Design a protein around this ligand. Structure first.
Ligand SMILES: O=c1[nH]cnc2c([C@@H]3N[C@H](CO)[C@@H](O)[C@H]3O)c[nH]c12
Ligand SMILES: O=c1[nH]cnc2c([C@@H]3N[C@H](CO)[C@@H](O)[C@H]3O)c[nH]c12
Ligand SMILES: [Ca+2]
Ligand SMILES: [Ca+2]
Lengths: 316, 314
C-alpha cells in the first residue's frame, strides 16, 4: 500500500540521499517522478545524477522507471557558487557509472531531456489516479508555479507537500553582509514562490524547517558505518555522498514521507518576507485571520531516522 | 626483482592515487614505507587514510605491511585550507572503512603512531640492504632534513629521488597577491628544503615539473572508466578520488616503469627569498652545479592504462 510520491529537488548531496530514501522504501513509497532545479546545483549534472541513480536502482532492485524533468525556474537570490554541487562530482563516481546502468540511462535520457520540470510536476499530480505526496528538498518555485497555473485542480490532487525549508523559532542559515541570518536558503532562493506556497489554502503542508533539521548533524562516525555495508550498492552511494555545518536536511524530510513517526507536527500560520530587508526570505508566524496552517516538524526522532537511513541503504 | 621504494607524501588525492600505483605494482615496486606531511592535508587524516588504504590492500592481495610515519615538518607557506580537508573526506569513504580492514589498522596503529616521519625516512633508506628510491609527492622538507642530518651516509643509499614539483619552462601554479605565478606549490611550501635537495651533489634526482604533468589532465570520460571495474576495490577507490591533473600519480607511475617518460639533465636551483618568485625552480649556469633529470613528453596513454590496470589488483 505505497503512496505516490514525486521528488522536487535541487541536486545537492542531501537531495540525492533523500532520493535513495524515497526510492529504496518501495513498501511505503512509489516514486512516480522527479524534477531538478538549477539552484543548489547545475541542473544538467543534477538531472544526470538523478537518472544514473534511478537506473542503478532499476537494475538492482526492480525499482520501476519514472520520468525526470529539468525545471525552468530561475533564482531570485542565487545559491553560493561553492555549494552548487558535488553533483558534478557525483556524475563521475564509479558506483553511478556501471556499464549496464549507464547504458540504460543513455537509452531513456533523450525523452526525459524533453520534459519541462514544472509541467511534469503539474501533470503527475493532476493525472495520477490516487493523490500524490510532493517531497520538496529544493526551492518552492515549482510548487508555486503549479499553484499559480492550475490552482485547485492541482492542490486538490496533492496528498501533502512535505517541504524542507525555513526556520521558525531558530536562526536561519543565510549569512550574507546584507542579511540578518534569520532566513533559510531554500526559501531565500525564491521568497515570492515560498509565500505563494505557504499561504495556499487547501494545500496540506508539512514543513521541516531548521528547528527540526538542526537535530541531525552529519558526523564522521555515523558516516563511516556505511563502510560496514560496502556489499550494498546504495551504501557505497550514500556513504560516498555523505563522506564528502552540514546536516541531513533533505534526508530527514524524505524520511518523514517514508514514515511519519520520524516527527510530530504542530500547526503554524506561515508567511514569508518578500521585501528586500535583512530578513528577506524568513518564514514568520503571521496573525492574519483565516490564514492557512502549515504543520511544522518538531522533536524529530534522530536515532530512528539514522537507523532508517542505514537500513534503507541495504535495499541493494 | 622489485626495487625498494618509500613514498614521502602530503595526503591529497593524487598522493593517494600515487600510493595505490606503487602499492599495486608488486612486480616492480617493493613499498617499504611511507611518511605523511601535514601540508596538502591535515597529517592525522593523511596518516589514517594511508593506513586504511594499506590495510584495505593487504587484506585483498599480497602486499606486505610497511611502517607509516607522521612527519614533523612544518610549512614555510601553507596550502589553502580548502584542499587540505580532502584527506578528511577520504577518511570517511565507505571503501576505506570496511570493518575487517579498519580492525587490522586499529591493530597495527600503535606500532606506527610512534615513528617520527623524517627519522623513519632516514632509517628505511640507510638500513636497507639495497638502495632505495624515494617517491616525493609532497614538499621536500623531509628529504632535506635527512640530507641536513646525515649527508652522504643518507644520499649514498638513495637509488634516486623521484620528485613531483616545480615548473621549468612553463608557468607555476602558486597564484597569490604576493607571488608572480612562476612557482609551483610543493616547492613554495618550503623553498629552503627544496634548494638543499636540488643542489645536493651525489643525489640522483628525477623531476616531474608542471612542464610534464600539465600534459596529463584528469578527465571525466576517463574517470568514468573506473565504473567498468566496480568489482575491484581499488577501482572504486581510485575512481572515487578522481571523481571528487594527475601530478603525483604520473610521478609514481615513473617509479613503477621509467618508460613513462624520457628525462633531460638540467641544473636546477630554487628561489628562497620572500619575493614574488619565491619557490620558483630556475635553471642555473653556476659551474659544477648538480644536474636534475627533468621529465619530458610523458606517455599519457601508457600512464592511463597502467593506472586502470593497476586498479584491478584487488
Ligand atoms: O553548505 C551547504 N552545502 C550544500 N547544500 C546546502 C544547503 C541546501 N539548502 C537546504 C538547507 O538550508 C537543503 O535542501 C540543502 O540541500 C544548505 N546549506 C548547504
Ligand atoms: O587544486 C588543487 N587541489 C589539490 N591538490 C593540489 C595541488 C598539490 N600540489 C602538487 C602540484 O602542484 C601535488 O603534489 C598536489 O597534491 C596543487 N593544486 C591542487
Ligand atoms: Ca536541497
Ligand atoms: Ca601531493
Amino acid at each position: 500500500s505505497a503512496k505516490n510520491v514525486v521528488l522536487d529537488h535541487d541536486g545537492n548531496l542531501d537531495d540525492f540521499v533523500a532520493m535513495v530514501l524515497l526510492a529504496s522504501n518501495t513498501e511505503k513509497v512509489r516514486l512516480i517522478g522527479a524534477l531538478c532545479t538549477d539552484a543548489d546545483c547545475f541542473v544538467e549534472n543534477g538531472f544526470n545524477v538523478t537518472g544514473k541513480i534511478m537506473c542503478l536502482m532499476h537494475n538492482n532492485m526492480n525499482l520501476p522507471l519514472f520520468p525526470i524533468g529539468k525545471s525552468a525556474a530561475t533564482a531570485v537570490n542565487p545559491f553560493p557558487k561553492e555549494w552548487r554541487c558535488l553533483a558534478k562530482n557525483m556524475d563521475d563516481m564509479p558506483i553511478l557509472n556501471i556499464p549496464e546502468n549507464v547504458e540504460l540511462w543513455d537509452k531513456i535520457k533523450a525523452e526525459n531531456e524533453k520534459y519541462e520540470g514544472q509541467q511534469l510536476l503539474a501533470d503527475l499530480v493532476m493525472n495520477s489516479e490516487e493523490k500524490v505526496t510532493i517531497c520538496v528538498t529544493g526551492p518552492l518555485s515549482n510548487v508555486a508555479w503549479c499553484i499559480d497555473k492550475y490552482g485547485e485542480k492541482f492542490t486538490s490532487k496533492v496528498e501533502e507537500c512535505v517541504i524542507m525549508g525555513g526556520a521558525v523559532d531558530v536562526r536561519g542559515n543565510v549569512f550574507l553582509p546584507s542579511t540578518d541570518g534569520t532566513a533559510e536558503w531554500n526559501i531565500y532562493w525564491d521568497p515570492a514562490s515560498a509565500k505563494t506556497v505557504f499561504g495556499c489554502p487547501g494545500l496540506r503542508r508539512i514543513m521541516f524547517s531548521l528547528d527540526s533539521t538542526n537535530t541531525v548533524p552529519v558526523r564522521s562516525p555515523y558516516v563511516q558505518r556505511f563502510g560496514e555495508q560496502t556489499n550494498f550498492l546504495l551504501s557505497i552511494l550514500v556513504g560516498t555522498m555523505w563522506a564528502m555545518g552540514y546536516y541531513a536536511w533533505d534526508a530527514l524530510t524524505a524520511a518523514y514521507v517514508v514514515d511519519q513517526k520520524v516527527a510530530n507536527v504542530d500547526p503554524v500560520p506561515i508567511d514569508v518576507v518578500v521585501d528586500k530587508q535583512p530578513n528577506e526570505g524568513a518564514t514568520v508566524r503571521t496573525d492574519a485571520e483565516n490564514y492557512p496552517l502549515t504543520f511544522v516538524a518538531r522533536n524529530p526522532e534522530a536515532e530512528f531516522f539514522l537507523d532508517m537511513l542505514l537500513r534503507s541503504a541495504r535495499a541493494c
